[PDB]
Amino acid sequence: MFTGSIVAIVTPMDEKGNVCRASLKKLIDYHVASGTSAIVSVGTTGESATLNHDEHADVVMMTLDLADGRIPVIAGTGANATAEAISLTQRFNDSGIVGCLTVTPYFNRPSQEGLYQHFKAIAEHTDLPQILYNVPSRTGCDLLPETVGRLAKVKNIIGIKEATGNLTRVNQIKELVSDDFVLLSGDDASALDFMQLGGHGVISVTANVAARDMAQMCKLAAEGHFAEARVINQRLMPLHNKLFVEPNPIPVKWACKELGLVATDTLRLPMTPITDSGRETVRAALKHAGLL
Amino acid sequence: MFTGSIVAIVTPMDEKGNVCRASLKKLIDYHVASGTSAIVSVGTTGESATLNHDEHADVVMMTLDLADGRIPVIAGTGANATAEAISLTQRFNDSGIVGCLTVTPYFNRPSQEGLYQHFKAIAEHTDLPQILYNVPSRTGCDLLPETVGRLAKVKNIIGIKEATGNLTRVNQIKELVSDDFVLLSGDDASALDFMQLGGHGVISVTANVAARDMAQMCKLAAEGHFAEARVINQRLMPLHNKLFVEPNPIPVKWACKELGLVATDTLRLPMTPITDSGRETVRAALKHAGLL
Amino acid sequence: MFTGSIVAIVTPMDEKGNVCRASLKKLIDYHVASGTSAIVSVGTTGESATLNHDEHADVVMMTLDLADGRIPVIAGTGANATAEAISLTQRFNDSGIVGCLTVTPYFNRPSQEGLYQHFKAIAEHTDLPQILYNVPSRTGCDLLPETVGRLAKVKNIIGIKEATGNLTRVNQIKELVSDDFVLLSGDDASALDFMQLGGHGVISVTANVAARDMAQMCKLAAEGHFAEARVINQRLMPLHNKLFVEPNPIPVKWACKELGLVATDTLRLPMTPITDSGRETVRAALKHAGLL
Amino acid sequence: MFTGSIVAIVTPMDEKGNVCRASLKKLIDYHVASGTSAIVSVGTTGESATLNHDEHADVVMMTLDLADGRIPVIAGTGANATAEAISLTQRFNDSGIVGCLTVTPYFNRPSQEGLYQHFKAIAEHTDLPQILYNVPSRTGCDLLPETVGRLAKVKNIIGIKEATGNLTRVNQIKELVSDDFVLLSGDDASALDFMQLGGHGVISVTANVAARDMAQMCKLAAEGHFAEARVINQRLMPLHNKLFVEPNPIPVKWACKELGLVATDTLRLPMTPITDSGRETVRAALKHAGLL
Contact A53, A91 (CB under 8 A): yes
Closest alpha carbon to D286 in D223, D168, D206, D198? D206
Rounded Cα distance, B268 and B271, in Å: 6
Closest alpha carbon to C141 in D140, D255, A4, D228? D140
Cis peptide leading into residue C270 (ω within 30°): yes
Would you call D133 a catalytic residue per the annotation?
yes
Q: Which residues of A touch B121 (CB under 8 A)?
A: 269
Rounded Cα distance, C79 and C262, in Å: 28
Q: Which residues of B touch D188 (CB under 8 A)?
A: none
Active site residues of A: 133, 161
- What Å distances lie between residue B76 and B86, B139, B188, CA to CA? 12, 15, 18
Rounded Cα distance, D285 and D235, in Å: 9
Is chain C touching chain B, with at least 3 CB–CB pairs below 8 Å? Answer: no
Spatial CB neighbours of B258, under 8 Å, sequence gap ≥ 6: B282, B283, B286, B292
Instruction: Say which amino acid occupies B179.
Output: D
Contact B159, B188 (CB under 8 A): no
A291 alpha-carbon distance from chain centroid? 22
| C193 Cβ under 8 Å from any chain A Cβ | yes
| Method used to determine the 3D structure | X-ray
Q: Based on C-alpha coordinates, what's the Rg of chain B?
A: 18
Rounded Cα distance, B178 and B182, in Å: 9
Spatial CB neighbours of A283, under 8 Å, sequence gap ≥ 6: A258, A292
Rounded Cα distance, B260 and A160, in Å: 43
Distance of residue D233 Cα from the nearest chain B Cα, in angstroms = 11
Instruction: Say which amino acid occupies A196.
Output: Q
A212 alpha-carbon distance from chain centroid? 17
User: Which one is catalytic: D26, D30, D116, D133?
Assistant: D133
Contact C63, C28 (CB under 8 A): yes
The residues facing A100 across adjacent strands are A75, A130
Q: CA C217, C223, C225, C228: dihedral to nearest 10 degrees?
A: -20
Instruction: Say which amino acid occupies C169.
Output: R
Largest CA distance in chain A: 49
Contact B42, B54 (CB under 8 A): no
User: Counting Cβ atoms within 10 Å, is residue D273 exposed (0-12), middle (13-18) or buried (19+)?
Assistant: middle
Rounded Cα distance, B156 and B120, in Å: 9
Rounded Cα distance, C35 and C38, in Å: 9
**C234·A189 Cβ contact <8 A:** no
| CA dihedral for C240, C243, C246, C247, sign (positive or negative) | negative
A59-78 as b/e, with b when 16 or more CB fall inside 10 Å?
bbbbbbebbeeebbbbbbbb
Instruction: Say which amino acid occupies D206.
Output: T
**B108·A271 Cβ contact <8 A:** yes
Domain that holds residue A88: 1-292
* Strand ranges inside A88-139, DSSP E: 99-103, 130-134
φ and ψ of A101, to 5 deg: -105, 120
**C193·A234 Cβ contact <8 A:** no
The string of DSSP codes covering D152-202 is: HTSTTEEEEEE-S--TTHHHHHHTTS-TTSEEEES-GGGHHHHHHTT--EE
- What Å distances lie between residue B103 and A84, B111, B170, D95, CA to CA? 20, 14, 18, 59
Rounded Cα distance, B126 and D95, in Å: 71
Contact D222, D182 (CB under 8 A): no
φ and ψ of D278, to 5 deg: -65, -35
Contact C212, C232 (CB under 8 A): no
According to DSSP, the β-strands at C201-204 and C4-8 are parallel
CATH number at residue C177: 3.20.20.70
Rounded Cα distance, C195 and C178, in Å: 17
C29-58 as b/e, with b when 16 or more CB fall inside 10 Å?
bbbbebbbbbbbbbbbbbbbbbbeeebbbe
A 10 A CB-CB count for D15 gives 9
Q: Which residues of D touch C272 (CB under 8 A)?
A: 110-111, 113-114, 117
Q: Which of D50, D113, D271 sits opposite C272 (nearest CB)?
A: D113
φ and ψ of C100, to 5 deg: -125, 140
| B193 Cβ under 8 Å from any chain D Cβ | yes
Distance of residue B170 Cα from the nearest chain A Cα, in angstroms = 23
Nearest residue of D to residue C119 by CA position? D270
C65-103 as b/e, with b when 16 or more CB fall inside 10 Å?
ebbeeebbbbbbbbbbbbbbbbebbeebeeeebbbbbbb
The string of DSSP codes covering A39-71 is: EEESSTTTTGGGS-HHHHHHHHHHHHHHHTTSS
| A195 Cβ under 8 Å from any chain C Cβ | no
Spatial CB neighbours of B43, under 8 Å, sequence gap ≥ 6: B8, B9, B76, B101, B203
According to DSSP, the β-strands at A4-8 and A38-41 are parallel
CA angle A99, A100, A105 (to 5 degrees): 165
B88 alpha-carbon distance from chain centroid? 18
Going by the DSSP 8-state scheme, the letter that residue D13 receives in this structure is B
| CA dihedral for D156, D159, D163, D165, sign (positive or negative) | positive
Rounded Cα distance, C273 and C270, in Å: 10
Contact D65, D29 (CB under 8 A): no
- What Å distances lie between residue B94 and B41, B99, B126, B127, C121, CA to CA? 16, 11, 10, 10, 74
Half-sphere exposure of B123 (CA within 13 A, CB side): 21
**A117·B50 Cβ contact <8 A:** no
φ and ψ of D148, to 5 deg: -60, -40
Closest alpha carbon to B89 in B63, B124, B113, B115? B124
Spatial CB neighbours of A158, under 8 Å, sequence gap ≥ 6: A2, A99, A129, A130, A131, A180, A181, A182
Could you give the number of structural domains in chain A?
1
The residues facing D13 across adjacent strands are D19
Contact C218, C266 (CB under 8 A): no
| B118 Cβ under 8 Å from any chain A Cβ | yes
Spatial CB neighbours of D265, under 8 Å, sequence gap ≥ 6: D253, D254, D256, D257, D273, D274
A111 alpha-carbon distance from chain centroid? 24
Half-sphere exposure of B200 (CA within 13 A, CB side): 16
User: Counting Cβ atoms within 10 Å, is residue B21 exposed (0-12), middle (13-18) or buried (19+)?
Assistant: middle
The string of DSSP codes covering D184-198 is: EES-GGGHHHHHHTT
Rounded Cα distance, B162 and B142, in Å: 10
Report H helices in chain D: 21-33, 53-67, 82-90, 112-124, 136-139, 145-152, 169-174, 191-196, 211-222, 226-242, 250-258, 276-288
**D109·C247 Cβ contact <8 A:** yes
The residues facing C151 across adjacent strands are none
Cis peptide leading into residue B249 (ω within 30°): yes
φ and ψ of D8, to 5 deg: -85, 90
Report H helices in C125-268: 136-139, 145-152, 169-176, 191-196, 211-223, 226-242, 250-258
Contact D199, D161 (CB under 8 A): no
Rounded Cα distance, D125 and D145, in Å: 24
Instruction: Say which amino acid occupies D149.
Output: G
Nearest residue of B to residue A272 by CA position? B114
Distance of residue B223 Cα from the nearest chain D Cα, in angstroms = 14
Q: Which of D44, D114, D269 sits opposite C82 (nearest CB)?
A: D269
Rounded Cα distance, C185 and C217, in Å: 13
Q: Which residues of C touch A196 (CB under 8 A)?
A: 196-197
A203-221 as b/e, with b when 16 or more CB fall inside 10 Å?
bbbbbbbbbbbbbbbbbbb
| CA dihedral for A187, A193, A195, A199, sign (positive or negative) | negative
**A230·C190 Cβ contact <8 A:** no
| C176 Cβ under 8 Å from any chain A Cβ | no
Half-sphere exposure of A213 (CA within 13 A, CB side): 24
Half-sphere exposure of D57 (CA within 13 A, CB side): 12
| A197 Cβ under 8 Å from any chain C Cβ | yes
Say whether D203 sits in a helix, a strand or coil. Answer: strand
Write the residues followed by a gap in chain B (C–N more than 2.5 A).
none
* Strand ranges inside chain C, DSSP E: 4-8, 38-41, 73-76, 99-103, 130-134, 157-162, 182-185, 201-204
The string of DSSP codes covering A196-259 is: HTT--EEEESGGGT-HHHHHHHHHHHHHT-HHHHHHHHHHHHHHHHHTTSSSTTHHHHHHHHHT
Would you call C161 a catalytic residue per the annotation?
yes
Going by the DSSP 8-state scheme, the letter that residue A273 receives in this structure is P
Contact B60, B75 (CB under 8 A): yes
Write the residues followed by a gap in chain C (C–N more than 2.5 A).
none
Is chain A touching chain C, with at least 3 CB–CB pairs below 8 Å? Answer: yes
A 10 A CB-CB count for C279 gives 18
Q: Which residues of B touch A105 (CB under 8 A)?
A: 49, 270
Q: How many CB pairs (< 8 A) connect C and D?
A: 126
φ and ψ of D219, to 5 deg: -65, -50
The string of DSSP codes covering A127-180 is: SS-EEEEE-HHHHS----HHHHHHHHTSTTEEEEEE-S--TTHHHHHHHHS-TT
User: Counting Cβ atoms within 10 Å, is residue C226 exposed (0-12), middle (13-18) or buried (19+)?
Assistant: middle
Say whether D290 sits in a helix, a strand or coil. Answer: coil
Contact B213, B289 (CB under 8 A): yes
Q: CA A245, A250, A253, A258: dihedral to nearest 10 degrees?
A: -60
B neighbours by CB contacts (3+ pairs under 8 Å):
A, D
Rounded Cα distance, D185 and D199, in Å: 7
Resolution in A: 2.3
| B83 Cβ under 8 Å from any chain A Cβ | yes
Cis peptide leading into residue A72 (ω within 30°): no
Spatial CB neighbours of C32, under 8 Å, sequence gap ≥ 6: C67, C70, C71
Distance of residue A221 Cα from the nearest chain B Cα, in angstroms = 31
Q: Which residues of A touch B113 (CB under 8 A)?
A: 272
Distance of residue B151 Cα from the nearest chain A Cα, in angstroms = 15
User: Counting Cβ atoms within 10 Å, is residue C223 exposed (0-12), middle (13-18) or buried (19+)?
Assistant: exposed
- What Å distances lie between residue B143 and A104, B112, B135, CA to CA? 23, 7, 9
Q: Which residues of B touch D165 (CB under 8 A)?
A: 168
Per the annotation, binding residues of B for pyruvate are 45, 203
Active site residues of B: 133, 161
